[PDB]
């Protein structure tokens, strides 16, 4: 289930020729490189330890590509302005996600390529890496334009070739970092809520990777729809946090139990107030 992805964002700056461009690469959801046109010296840069391995020629080459990408997004942004009959006195956004996924058998599982305009799906490359799926009318224009130009072949080649090549490389160099886990440190807290009712909150802290599952149980049944689950958040040190709580009758807290499932936990935890 390993993967690599590049999330690119181009934001038009009204009146100015050049849009701001930011590119972020990820391996197994971990940011490993980043390029930002706003820097004093635009350049792709390491965002993870094991990328120190690469020599200068690597960063130079990636940086060159970024410059190419900037031009592409600039022209695309302009074209989109016309498709939607929008004024250029305002800012606009064009985003792209591309990359590859490795299945269980380390083979290529799927290639990805999708664009969004103003934060909404615009056009995407189908899993066949041959056909395009357009989200609206404007996108259809792009779609018909790319089928005639054979753009897909270009993307398919990167997705099944260079994409797989480097993902394997990065997985090999950052193996000791990417394949690690930090199982969660959990506990249950008790809080006032309302008359005759209290809140029990189950916390999971300092865990990695982010994937996790917390559940509450009453009489052997999980409280599927009577539980508040916050969205997973960054601790800021590379690990994540999360919690799930339930409002229970005062004097019956004991009847409830929390379970924490994480790939760092061979056996799921079972906590209570």
């Amino acid at each position: 289930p390993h993967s690599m992805r590049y999330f690119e964002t181009a934001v038009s700056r009204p009146g100015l020729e050049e849009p701001r461009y930011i590119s972020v690469g990820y391996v197994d959801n971990k940011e490993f490189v980043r390029f930002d046109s706003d820097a004093e010296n635009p350049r792709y840069e390491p965002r993870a330890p094991w990328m120190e391995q690469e020599g200068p020629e690597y960063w130079e080459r990636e940086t060159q590509k970024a410059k190419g990408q900037e031009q592409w997004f600039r022209v695309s942004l302009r074209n989109l302005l016309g498709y939607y009959n929008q004024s250029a006195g305002g800012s606009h956004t064009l985003q792209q996600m591309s990359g590859c996924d490795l299945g269980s058998d380390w083979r290529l599982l799927r290639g990805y390529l999708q664009f969004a305009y103003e934060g909404r799906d615009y056009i995407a490359l189908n899993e066949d890496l041959k056909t395009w799926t357009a989200a609206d009318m404007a996108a259809q224009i792009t779609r018909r334009k790319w089928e005639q130009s054979g753009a897909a072949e270009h993307y398919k080649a990167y997705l099944e070739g260079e994409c797989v090549e480097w993902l394997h490389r990065y997985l090999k160099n950052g193996n000791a970092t990417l394949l690690r886990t930090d199982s969660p440190k959990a506990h249950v807290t008790h809080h006032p809520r309302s008359k005759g009712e209290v809140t029990l909150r189950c916390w999971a802290l300092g865990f990695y990777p982010a994937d996790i599952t917390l559940t509450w149980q009453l009489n052997g049944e999980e409280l599927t729809q009577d539980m508040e689950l916050v969205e997973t958040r960054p601790a800021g040190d590379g690990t994540f946090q999360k919690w799930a709580s339930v409002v229970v009758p005062l004097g019956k807290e004991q009847n409830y139990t929390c379970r924490v499932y994480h790939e760092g936990l061979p056996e799921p935890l079972t906590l209570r107030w």
Binding site: G25, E62, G68, L80, K145, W146, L159, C163
Partner: peptide, 10 residues
Amino acid sequence: SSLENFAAYV
């Protein structure tokens, strides 16, 4: 290694 888009723009 990042991808370089095809010559054809949107």
